[PDB]
């Protein structure tokens with residue numbers, strides 16, 4: 001079958017590698033980014049997936065070479081300030097904890113953590129960086145009234 | 158089955174109706190919005206769809222009550238300045254022409270028009286407004302070197 005089913009797709013893969021293009025691009029309000037996913041899940045649903053699993057694939061495709069690059073991608077995406085102590089990850093055994101400051105969807109209040117897409121992204125990116133399969137579970141979230149979101153990172157086989 | 162398969166989906170439907178929330182939301186650079194679609198089409202592909210057909214559904218869901226509201230949604234989305242003469246649409250027979258100024262993806266150069274998602278959106282929105290089934294075909298595009306994109310609007314049964 002065809003590598004790319006739509007016209008714009010090869011160009012998007014070039015652009016995500018170009019910080020000047022990202023900085024000059026039009027910015028879309030997050031409610032519309034979410035609406036897209038909502039509309040295409042209605043269409044997925046004769047198949048099925050999750051925002052976490054899509055974030056995993058998204059993360060793979062972003063393919064950051066290191067933690068500093070991971071942090072940079074989150075600023076470029078306007079997804080917030082990712083707090084990761086890399087030297088401690090290297091020194092310690094898992095599970096680890098990482099935090100996100102100034103995340104999207106702060107206008108949302110929910111009892112349960114909301115950032116499933118971001119958690120997937122983090123799992124996917126951490127595999128690209130460190131090789132291991134990771135599972136990332138958000139255990140605290142700004143939308144619960146917390147000041148930062150907190151993610152538990154687990155290495156798995 | 159469940160109305161909403163993900164946590165954030167009911168909240169997104171409320172937010173798209175709230176201009177204050179849109180204005181205060183985080184803005185995402187368009188290359189990442191496109192990457193999302195690229196990643197979830199790879200996953201769609203054991204099924205199949207198009208950016209045009211998703212735009213149709215997106216348009217339906219936005220459900221603008223009139224042309225002025227359609228124009229406003231495009232500014233809120235940061236998708237550009239939509240040029241539509243409503244009094245002429247009312248007076249004349251189809252097909253019509255509408256234009257878009259300052260669209261996304263101006264860093265893209267392509268021989269063929271690129272704004273398939275926007276063209277779908279327009280078809281879907283025009284059906285919500287006028288009831289008829291519409292087909293919208295982009296016949297000129299900024300990414301061809303033109304100053305504005307141009308869409309042909311056809312009424313169909």
Ligand SMILES: [Cl-]
Pocket residue numbers: 030031103104105106107181182183
């Ligand atoms: Cl937001």
Ligand SMILES: [Cl-]
Pocket residue numbers: 024025026187188260261262263264
């Ligand atoms: Cl853009």
Ligand SMILES: [Zn+2]
Pocket residue numbers: 103113114115138140141142143149150
């Ligand atoms: Zn969170």
Ligand SMILES: [Zn+2]
Pocket residue numbers: 260270271272295297298299300306307
């Ligand atoms: Zn165009």
